Structure 1
Amino acid sequence: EVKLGELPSWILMRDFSPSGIFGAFQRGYYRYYNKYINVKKGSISGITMVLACYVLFSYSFSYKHLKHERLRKY
């Protein structure tokens, strides 16, 4: 996996198919869920990190409207 491979061919070795990216998201989901949520005596931070990643995704598309309230002019 990445963090270990150092070949620019790795990017083409992957399966860039609908079922490929689907299983890629499903794996990342179960990897997140199993590490932060699917644990007894778990914590709330397993959720807050999703909200912060959600806020950041929200502030992203909302930039095209928030760049007209700029205080400075440069």
Structure 2
Amino acid sequence: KDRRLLEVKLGELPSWILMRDFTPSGIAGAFQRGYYRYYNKYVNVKKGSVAGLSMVLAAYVVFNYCRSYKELKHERLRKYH
């Protein structure tokens, strides 16, 4: 049904696909929800910690590593097999 995807039944996945309407909310709506879900939970408190930014920085680092794989494995490989 309209419940969260982590709560929908396994056999109800095609049913929830029909319920996926308005979940993107023109794509941008889902991003609008997702930004505030994290921001209002780990940042917008009376007193936060360094954990607010470290997740984003680590995600940025891993995303950057994903791009350059082509060149690295191209020749930087040490051994064979």
Same fold by TM-score greater than 0.5: yes
TM-score by length of 2: 0.78
RMSD between aligned residues: 2.0
Amino acid at match of 1:8: L
Unpaired stretches in structure 2, ≥5 consecutive residues: none
TM-score by length of 1: 0.84
In the alignment of these two chains, the number of paired residues is: 74
For the Cα contact (< 8 Å) 1:15–1:21, is it kept in 2?
no
- Deviation, structure 1 residue 62: 1.1
User: Counterparts of 1:14 and 1:46 in 2: how far apart (Å)?
Assistant: 30
Q: Residue 26 of structure 2 aligns with which residue?
A: 20
Q: Residue 77 of structure 2 aligns with which residue?
A: 70
Q: Comparing 22-31 with 5-14, which one deviates more in the overlay?
A: 5-14
Output one character per residue of 1:4-48: Cα deviation in whole Å (capped at 9) or x when no partner. 012222134313797432111110110000011111211111101
Q: Residue 2 of structure 1 aligns with which residue?
A: 5
Give the structure, 1 or 2, with the largest relative contact order (CA under 8 Å, sep 6 or more).
2
Amino acid at match of 2:41: K
Rg comparison, structure with higher value: 2
